[PDB]
């Protein structure tokens, strides 16, 4: 044959993979967590956006911390042999390292570990994407006017906000991070490598949103998402 190169993840398996969207809007009264108004906008837009990329989307809504873990354990035991990648979107409350089911928290690690290269063989060496719209702490950004591969390899964490910070959601328009994520896939999935799309998403969230509140503490705050890439090749949502 000719000279070959292997800098990109193989994305021409018969199927792109599963997109799991976990949309948690209403929380058990006993936890003291408010309903996450507007997250249905986020859920519908993701579904539509990942449909266009040819992912097999499964929306789940108002899952308990047990149903979250069981869903993920079940999904990690399916046979992904014919699938190119795996995407999982978590829409919910949280703290650093943690996402809330409707009745209490789940550590992100417990979820992701299900897909470690050694625990989910049919996904070994395929890109596993985790998109997290949740709080990562309580800080507010005031802005300024202008043994062959690691088990942990091949993950990409697309964080809505920086470590330790609040994540912003609009009750009519959806969450800043997700509006921008879907817009930028619409417009750039057939042109840009994923890392360059997230960078666009970063710039949009950072440049075009400023919170508005009657409460001095919460008014005029900003957000910058966090890309955590343990990927080992470049990731394009198209193939040749």
């Amino acid at each position: 044959s000719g000279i070959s190169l292997d800098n990109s993840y193989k994305m021409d398996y018969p199927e792109m993979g599963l997109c799991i969207i976990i949309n948690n809007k209403n929380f058990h009264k006993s936890t003291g967590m408010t309903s996450r108004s507007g997250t249905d906008v986020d859920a519908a837009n993701l579904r539509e956006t990942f449909r266009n990329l040819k992912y097999e989307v499964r929306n789940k809504n108002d899952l308990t911390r047990e149903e979250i873990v069981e869903l993920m354990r079940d999904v990690s035991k399916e046979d992904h042999s014919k699938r190119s990648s795996f995407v999982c979107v978590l829409l919910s409350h949280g703290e650093e390292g943690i996402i809330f089911g409707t009745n209490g928290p789940v550590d992100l690690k417990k979820i992701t570990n299900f897909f470690r290269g050694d625990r989910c063989r049919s996904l070994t060496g395929k890109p596993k994407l985790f998109i997290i719209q949740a709080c990562r702490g309580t800080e507010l950004d005031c802005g300024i006017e202008t043994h062959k591969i690691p088990v942990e390899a091949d993950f990409l964490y697309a964080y809505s906000t920086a470590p330790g910070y609040y994540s912003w959601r609009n009750s009519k328009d959806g969450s800043w991070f997700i509006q921008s994520l879907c817009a930028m896939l619409k417009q750039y999935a057939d042109k840009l490598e994923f890392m360059h799309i997230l960078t666009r998403v970063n710039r949009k969230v950072a440049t075009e949103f400023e919170s508005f509140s009657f409460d001095a503490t919460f008014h005029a705050k900003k957000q910058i998402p966090c890309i955590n890439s343990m990927l080992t090749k470049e990731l394009y949502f198209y193939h040749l």
């Binding site: 409350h93 949740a134 609040y166 994540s167 912003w168 969450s175």
Partner: peptide, 4 residues
């Protein structure tokens, strides 16, 4: 606008 609300925080999650």
């Amino acid at each position: 606008d609300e925080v999650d």
